[PDB]
Amino acid sequence: PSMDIIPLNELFSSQVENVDWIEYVMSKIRAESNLHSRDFILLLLDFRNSWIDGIKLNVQFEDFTSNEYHVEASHTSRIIVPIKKIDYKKYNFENTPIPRIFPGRQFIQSGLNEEQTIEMRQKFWCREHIISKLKCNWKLTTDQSVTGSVDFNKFIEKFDHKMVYTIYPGRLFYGVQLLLDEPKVKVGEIINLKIITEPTSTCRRKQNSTVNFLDIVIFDSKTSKILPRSNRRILYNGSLTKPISTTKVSEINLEIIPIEKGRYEFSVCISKSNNQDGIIQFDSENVILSVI
Amino acid sequence: ELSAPDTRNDYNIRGDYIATTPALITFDGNESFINCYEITANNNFDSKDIFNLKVRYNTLKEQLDCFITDAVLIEGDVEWFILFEKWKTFWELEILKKLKYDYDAFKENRIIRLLKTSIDLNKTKSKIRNLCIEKAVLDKILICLNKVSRGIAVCNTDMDEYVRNLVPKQLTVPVQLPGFEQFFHVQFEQMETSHDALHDTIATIGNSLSYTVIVENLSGQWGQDVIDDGGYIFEILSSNEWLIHGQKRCAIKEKRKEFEVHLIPLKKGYLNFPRVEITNIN
Amino acid sequence: LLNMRLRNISLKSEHCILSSLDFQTSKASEQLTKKFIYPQEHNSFLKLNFQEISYKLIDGTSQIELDPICPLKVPLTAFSYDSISATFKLVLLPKSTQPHRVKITLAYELELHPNLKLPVRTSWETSLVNSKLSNVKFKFINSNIKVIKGEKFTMRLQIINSSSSPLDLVVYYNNTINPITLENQYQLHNKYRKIAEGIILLSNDYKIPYFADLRFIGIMSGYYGTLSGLKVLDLNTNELIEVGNGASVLI
């Protein structure tokens, strides 16, 4: 009787690799050596028992396995499954499925009809993707062999707006990777940084400013980003604002002339304009480099 | 471009900025455009010469109206054969009072007049009459630069044909001081509360004065404050300066002010006055 | 009037009180004897500190400063040793003695002996989270102690009630980015993103009915000071009060 979805950022380590989901994501990422994280989001189910004995609670999503999740009498327990997030460059998701009573009533939509009619379509189609694989099998604790399932279509409520862009990239605007030369540069050396941006199908709401202003912000990999005047820390050519199109895969550059450092971090944001409160999204792509 | 001076220095500069991926790297008088230059020193120590910058700037106010001139009202080479030619200086007495929208040219809205005087200006056809591909077809192009303002119409495509290349070239001082020495303080932290995970800012200095001083500040802590008393122990090498600290307290107004108003001072052994401090809390 | 001395005391509330005296060279006295020293062809002074001691002023007591000290002698300098006091509860201003022994010097003889002692009071003087309604005090039974390694761990919110309806309330973590000078927008966004996404709280709406265990897992690194998010909520309208307490490095 609740639901929450949380992304993932830490690669993790081998000595803690004994709980099921981290060894699942690590084992899945032993091959396919382009993804590391930020693509293996993590959804938080919370099973609650309204009965009078323990149950054992497996869950299998796709090839995910579980432990012997021993639940108790009236005890809520939280069960953690990892999913690769729904890519909109493997699909399109602009289809309403008609129900099973073809009564031909042919009703209205009655909102901003290009926005909510496909927005709630995005909601219950991502709900269709979550429902259509998630499988549980439960047996009562040493007093039966009652091995049944537990259906979910009376349980998963809707998706709120956090639980759309957490599950579905393509709710927010630009897909961004960050292509870098080396992570292990010495001090006196010059590095081209190369972000690569992908404008989306869901830029169709505006089209007005084809130009859209980004930023590049540099974090210390503790906290507390360096200022524009990055004195004795990092050096660069020109103002970092460096526009992109809402047309195609634009590229951009800087020249991170490093000076007297270690363990930096680079990430962007999207600002649409020059003014304050123009900023509309903050990406989370955080490529770190070290300086020796 | 920053380059060599007029001596036989041959300094191994490697930093530069040519606009190589754009040709139009804009600027709008509120942001930075920081340009950085690695001037690595040659076979000797770096001297005190005068270097020279080379900036090939241009104002925006000639660039933006080329699509308002060579595209909007000079399309056909017969419609711009004689219509422009006998009134080019009349066009340059017309477009010089354009007063374009350089107050909202940050976000969008390039190539718009900002409504200085739009309606009274069309009386110029009366007292002087020329070819109607200019005298009657450019008032529509004056409306086409009044409305129809494109946010970014790829303005580097129609730039290089008419943009003049101004070139300021200022000096560059390499301004500095002259006293080279060194230091190396060593330290070992004494427990206060718990280790807070200390992080380093830096270690370098440059100074020359009369009754000269060299002040230093400690590292940066990112746990709970009033932190561990750093106990320090000197190796005040290669000189004889004057110490002023012993076993400070690392999140406070204490400062290991190793002053130097004294002798044993070599001169000009590097790019400036330098004394590589390099404190070590290990 | 040869070496100006000052004592600075800082009140570390989670430990003892720390007070450090500080010697200096007193420049308005150094140029005095510099004039006669360069009259006798000497560049700087050679005062020798041979017996420096802080004693706890009482009927009779003495202490020992919190690191090591040799018998030193410096020309134009400053030194500062630190000694730990005892953090008083309320209203007892302790006093100290702070004796010293500067030995001056001349041409291998004529060591004019000096001594000084400035006795004064060592009181400069500039984690329970109360409920702020009915003294339902919360304290973690191991606060600020956790070196986890992205493993599970358990804590202990020892709630202390009025023992008058002691079964009332529910904890929760609120994994949601709060909705908030442009880099003042970005620092608040990075703080609110790393708060609401780094740890999970495996017992979410635990509904406590007076210990708790509260197992977390913690999926990103970094020092999480003050551990925000971990709210409780109680029988009245909105007792949405924080814990504001406890911290964990996760590496």
Short mmCIF file of C-alpha atoms in Angstrom, two decimals, chain B residues 32-191:
data_model
loop_
_atom_site.label_atom_id
_atom_site.label_comp_id
_atom_site.label_asym_id
_atom_site.label_seq_id
_atom_site.Cartn_x
_atom_site.Cartn_y
_atom_site.Cartn_z
CA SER B 32 33.05 36.43 -18.25
CA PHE B 33 34.72 35.03 -21.39
CA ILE B 34 37.72 33.96 -19.34
CA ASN B 35 40.67 33.20 -21.60
CA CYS B 36 43.51 31.14 -20.18
CA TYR B 37 47.07 30.83 -21.43
CA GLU B 38 49.79 28.37 -20.51
CA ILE B 39 53.11 30.21 -20.82
CA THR B 40 55.62 27.52 -19.89
CA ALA B 41 59.14 28.79 -19.33
CA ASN B 42 62.11 28.13 -21.63
CA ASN B 43 65.64 26.84 -20.93
CA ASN B 44 66.28 29.59 -18.36
CA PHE B 45 64.06 31.17 -15.72
CA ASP B 46 61.26 33.37 -17.08
CA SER B 47 62.43 36.99 -17.41
CA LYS B 48 60.69 40.35 -17.14
CA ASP B 49 59.79 41.30 -20.71
CA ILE B 50 56.70 42.91 -22.19
CA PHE B 51 54.42 40.54 -24.06
CA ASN B 52 51.72 41.44 -26.56
CA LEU B 53 48.10 40.39 -26.85
CA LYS B 54 46.32 40.25 -30.22
CA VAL B 55 42.51 40.40 -30.17
CA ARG B 56 40.55 40.44 -33.43
CA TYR B 57 37.30 41.83 -32.08
CA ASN B 58 34.31 43.42 -33.81
CA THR B 59 31.20 45.15 -32.62
CA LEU B 60 27.87 43.43 -33.18
CA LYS B 61 26.22 46.52 -34.70
CA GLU B 62 27.69 45.95 -38.17
CA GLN B 63 27.19 42.18 -38.20
CA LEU B 64 23.45 41.78 -37.56
CA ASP B 65 22.15 43.97 -40.39
CA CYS B 66 23.90 42.06 -43.19
CA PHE B 67 20.83 39.84 -43.52
CA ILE B 68 18.86 43.09 -43.34
CA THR B 69 21.00 44.40 -46.21
CA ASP B 70 22.50 41.62 -48.37
CA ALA B 71 19.57 39.21 -47.99
CA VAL B 72 16.40 41.23 -47.36
CA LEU B 73 17.00 44.12 -49.79
CA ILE B 74 19.84 42.94 -52.07
CA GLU B 75 18.46 39.58 -53.23
CA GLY B 76 18.64 39.86 -57.02
CA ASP B 77 21.86 41.05 -58.66
CA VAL B 78 19.77 43.21 -61.04
CA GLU B 79 17.52 44.54 -58.27
CA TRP B 80 20.74 45.35 -56.39
CA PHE B 81 22.63 46.42 -59.54
CA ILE B 82 21.98 50.16 -59.56
CA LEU B 83 19.39 50.56 -56.78
CA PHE B 84 22.00 50.07 -54.06
CA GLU B 85 24.93 51.72 -55.94
CA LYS B 86 23.65 55.30 -56.21
CA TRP B 87 22.26 55.27 -52.66
CA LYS B 88 24.79 53.13 -50.74
CA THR B 89 25.97 56.15 -48.76
CA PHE B 90 22.29 57.07 -48.53
CA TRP B 91 21.72 53.55 -47.18
CA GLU B 92 24.67 54.11 -44.85
CA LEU B 93 22.96 57.34 -43.82
CA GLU B 94 19.82 55.25 -43.32
CA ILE B 95 21.07 52.13 -41.52
CA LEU B 96 23.41 54.06 -39.21
CA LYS B 97 20.36 55.33 -37.32
CA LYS B 98 18.79 51.87 -36.94
CA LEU B 99 19.23 51.62 -33.11
CA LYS B 100 18.77 47.86 -32.87
CA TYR B 101 17.45 45.80 -29.96
CA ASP B 102 20.60 45.40 -27.86
CA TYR B 103 18.68 45.35 -24.56
CA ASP B 104 16.94 42.00 -25.06
CA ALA B 105 19.47 40.45 -27.45
CA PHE B 106 20.58 37.96 -24.80
CA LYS B 107 17.76 35.40 -24.96
CA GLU B 108 16.27 36.01 -28.40
CA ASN B 109 15.00 38.88 -30.53
CA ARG B 110 18.00 39.71 -32.63
CA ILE B 111 17.26 41.67 -35.86
CA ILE B 112 14.48 43.92 -34.54
CA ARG B 113 14.29 47.67 -34.34
CA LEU B 114 13.33 48.61 -30.80
CA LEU B 115 10.74 51.25 -31.91
CA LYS B 116 12.79 54.44 -32.01
CA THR B 117 10.76 56.20 -34.72
CA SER B 118 9.15 53.79 -37.17
CA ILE B 119 6.37 55.83 -38.78
CA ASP B 120 7.96 59.22 -39.49
CA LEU B 121 11.03 57.73 -41.19
CA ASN B 122 9.29 56.86 -44.47
CA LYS B 123 9.15 60.50 -45.62
CA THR B 124 12.65 60.20 -47.12
CA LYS B 125 11.22 58.95 -50.42
CA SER B 126 9.67 62.39 -51.07
CA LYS B 127 12.58 64.86 -51.05
CA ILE B 128 14.95 62.32 -52.65
CA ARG B 129 13.83 59.73 -55.20
CA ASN B 130 15.91 56.80 -56.46
CA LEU B 131 15.33 53.29 -57.83
CA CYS B 132 12.24 51.55 -56.42
CA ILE B 133 14.14 48.32 -55.70
CA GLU B 134 15.75 50.47 -52.97
CA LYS B 135 13.51 53.54 -52.64
CA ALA B 136 10.31 51.48 -52.51
CA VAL B 137 11.37 47.87 -51.82
CA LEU B 138 13.51 48.49 -48.72
CA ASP B 139 10.78 50.16 -46.66
CA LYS B 140 9.18 46.72 -46.75
CA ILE B 141 12.64 45.46 -45.74
CA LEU B 142 12.56 48.15 -43.05
CA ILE B 143 9.34 46.51 -41.91
CA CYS B 144 11.08 43.12 -42.31
CA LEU B 145 13.69 44.32 -39.81
CA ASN B 146 10.96 45.89 -37.66
CA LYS B 147 8.91 42.73 -37.33
CA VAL B 148 10.19 39.21 -38.24
CA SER B 149 12.98 39.04 -35.66
CA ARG B 150 14.78 35.70 -35.75
CA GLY B 151 16.33 34.47 -32.51
CA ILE B 152 19.29 32.72 -34.17
CA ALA B 153 19.11 32.57 -37.98
CA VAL B 154 22.65 31.08 -38.27
CA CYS B 155 24.30 34.48 -38.41
CA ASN B 156 27.82 33.13 -39.04
CA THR B 157 26.65 31.95 -42.48
CA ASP B 158 26.16 35.51 -43.77
CA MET B 159 28.90 37.11 -41.65
CA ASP B 160 32.25 36.87 -43.47
CA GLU B 161 31.24 38.79 -46.61
CA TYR B 162 30.78 42.19 -44.92
CA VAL B 163 32.12 42.09 -41.35
CA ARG B 164 35.21 44.27 -40.95
CA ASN B 165 38.07 42.97 -38.83
CA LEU B 166 39.07 45.44 -36.13
CA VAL B 167 42.18 44.44 -34.21
CA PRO B 168 43.16 45.93 -30.89
CA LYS B 169 46.55 44.68 -29.69
CA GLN B 170 47.42 45.61 -26.14
CA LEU B 171 50.61 44.91 -24.22
CA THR B 172 51.07 42.25 -21.55
CA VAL B 173 53.20 43.18 -18.58
CA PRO B 174 54.29 39.85 -16.99
CA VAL B 175 54.25 41.94 -13.82
CA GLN B 176 56.04 40.30 -10.94
CA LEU B 177 58.32 40.56 -7.93
CA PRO B 178 61.84 39.26 -7.35
CA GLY B 179 62.85 37.12 -4.37
CA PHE B 180 63.22 33.38 -4.80
CA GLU B 181 63.48 31.03 -1.83
CA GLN B 182 61.73 27.93 -0.52
CA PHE B 183 60.18 26.44 2.60
CA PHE B 184 58.80 23.11 3.79
CA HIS B 185 56.81 22.95 6.99
CA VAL B 186 55.85 19.50 8.26
CA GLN B 187 52.96 18.69 10.57
CA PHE B 188 51.26 15.94 12.56
CA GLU B 189 47.65 16.34 13.68
CA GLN B 190 46.71 16.10 17.36
CA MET B 191 43.23 14.71 18.07
#
